[PDB]
């Protein structure tokens, strides 16, 4: 009831002034200019797509229930229901945004049914242009594009005979007798549903969140895999501030959001309500019981039972960046509120590739199918974080800052020799021009009877910016951490040791000698100081 004001009640209950609303109006307007919002039309399409999927979910269940020899009535009554979660469910999605979707089915519908029956029902539709089923994923999923709109579909199987249209997923007992995959599948929806019910004024929250997502992206502090808060974390952080200021407008919320998160007594958790127990043998976030939990540095806790920490990955170095960025938020928003800066300023692109003197490139190379490369580089990427952690503990390392995005390229690679060379010359601007000799495969140039044919080599590169501690005279030695990292890129139940195909290289590089790929059309690379 008072749940909407969070665990300490409001900080202030005073509503917005006119001067505040004007600055809110210009925010929404900046958000519009920046293309946060899709038109009413493309939202209308989204709604219609889910309708069709809702119809198909009901059909799916109906058909399976007929196969188990229920009557017509019982098959209909068995129901089946579509829920959204993540960005779309929250009202913060953008023009290109995927809809994260969950199909809920009664006890007698398996996921083997989902990957056969539901799959073939999807294939029947004219609106279906692409479908990628991935049964053996950590969460089993079907990725589709439907009427140009991207949908991610997951399946949850309840311990219940029927899933009526009226079903909401908020009751704890919906979790009884579920296996871990099903348990996991329910969580996304229950979490985002609860955030929505834990917020005083949802439209105010929606706008504040749109602002935070843009900022986080542009300031390069949005990437879970690399040790920054992802979407749900940011959503919950924004939700927390909304509770402290129930009547504030979004402009004000952003202001108070940067001040409070920058003065937060970190590692004390941000929580949207008191963490709860339940009847199940499932791990709840609990720093008292679990050493892992205790080591979280900026914990942001999901509210749906099993409460979990949505920022496990944050490292000492990423917390430093996040905190700098909040402190920057504090100065810019106060300036906006003083008529001295615009919102455009807050959303100014980061300058990661100008801010340090040295960088550590980490490159995954593949000479093979792009499916092989996806796998190989996906593996390498997931460890970058672990490298950050080994480096950041070292005496001479002031910070190890991972950038939040890989740099992808690919070349036609007719021979083994071309492949040695790509490996040799790539990554330094001194030698980078050597690979113009090899046709650079372009997002805009993929003539299938020429380019999309030749044996191709793929590169993915992550960058860690470095700051050293140096009034001391010595060679800074970081080979152990780099070597340990390499050995972490270990072939689990698949092999990457055939260097004729996969490779891994790290390279230490001075700022001025950074690869071109790293600078935009409008950026001029730095030079020898």
């Amino acid at each position: 009831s008072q749940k909407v004001f969070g665990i300490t009640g409001p900080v202030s209950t005073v509503g917005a002034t006119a001067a505040e609303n004007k600055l809110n109006d210009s925010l929404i307007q900046e958000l519009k200019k920046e293309g946060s919002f899709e038109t009413e039309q493309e939202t209308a399409n989204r709604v219609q797509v889910l309708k069709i999927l809702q119809e198909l979910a009901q059909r799916f269940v109906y058909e399976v229930s007929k196969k188990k020899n229920m009557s017509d009535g019982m098959a209909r009554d068995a129901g089946g229901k579509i829920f959204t979660y993540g960005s779309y469910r929250l009202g913060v999605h953008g023009p290109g945004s995927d809809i994260d979707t969950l199909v809920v089915v009664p006890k007698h519908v398996t996921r083997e049914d989902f990957f056969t029956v539901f799959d073939s029902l999807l294939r029947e539709r004219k609106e279906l242009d692409e479908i990628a089923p991935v049964p053996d994923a950590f969460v089993p999923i079907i990725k589709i594009k439907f009427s140009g709109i991207s949908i991610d579909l997951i399946c949850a199987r309840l311990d219940q005979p029927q899933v009526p249209l009226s079903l909401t997923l908020s009751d704890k007992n919906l979790l009884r007798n579920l296996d871990e995959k099903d348990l996991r599948a329910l969580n996304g929806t229950r979490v985002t549903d609860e955030i929505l019910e834990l917020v005083p004024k949802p439209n105010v929250f929606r706008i504040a969140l749109r602002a935070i997502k843009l900022w986080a992206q542009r300031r390069a502090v949005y990437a879970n895999i690399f040790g920054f808060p992802g979407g749900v974390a940011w959503a919950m952080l924004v939700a927390r501030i909304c509770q402290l200021y129930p009547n504030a407008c979004s402009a004000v919320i952003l202001n108070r959001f940067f001040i409070i998160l920058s003065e937060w007594n970190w590692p004390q958790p941000v929580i949207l309500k008191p963490i709860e127990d339940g009847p199940l043998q499932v791990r709840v976030w609990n720093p008292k019981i679990y050493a892992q939990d205790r080591s979280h540095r900026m914990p942001v806790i999901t509210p749906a039972y099993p409460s979990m920490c949505a920022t496990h990955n944050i490292t000492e170095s990423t917390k430093k960046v996040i905190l700098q960025e909040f402190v920057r938020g504090v100065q810019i928003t106060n300036d906006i509120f003083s008529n001295k800066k615009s919102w455009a300023n807050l959303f100014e692109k980061n300058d990661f590739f100008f801010r340090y003197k040295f960088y550590l490139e980490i490159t995954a190379y593949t000479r093979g199918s792009d499916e092989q490369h996806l796998k190989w580089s996906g593996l390498v990427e997931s460890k970058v974080r672990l490298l950050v952690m080994k480096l950041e503990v070292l005496a001479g390392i002031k910070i190890a800052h991972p950038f939040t995005k890989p740099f992808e390229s690919s070349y036609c690679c007719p021979t083994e020799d071309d492949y040695e060379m790509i490996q040799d010359k790539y990554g330094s601007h001194k030698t980078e021009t050597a690979l113009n000799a090899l046709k650079l495969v372009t997002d805009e140039n993929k003539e299938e009877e020429s380019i999309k044919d030749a044996p191709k080599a793929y590169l993915s590169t992550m960058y860690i910016g470095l700051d050293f501690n140096i009034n001391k005279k010595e060679k800074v030695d970081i080979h152990i951490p780099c070597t340990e990292f390499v050995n972490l890129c270990r072939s689990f139940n698949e092999d990457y040791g055939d260097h004729k195909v996969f490779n891994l290289a790290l390279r230490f590089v001075k700022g001025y000698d950074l690869p071109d790929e790293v600078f935009d059309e409008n950026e001029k690379r730095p030079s020898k100081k």
């Binding site: 800074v476 970081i478 780099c482 070597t483 390499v486 790290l506 390279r507 230490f508």
Partner: peptide
Amino acid sequence: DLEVIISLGPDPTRLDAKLLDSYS
């Protein structure tokens, strides 16, 4: 000109994973 060692190879600023065992 700061010296930073990331590998024990011929080029201390370059670590190629397949050569790792041939360095040390």
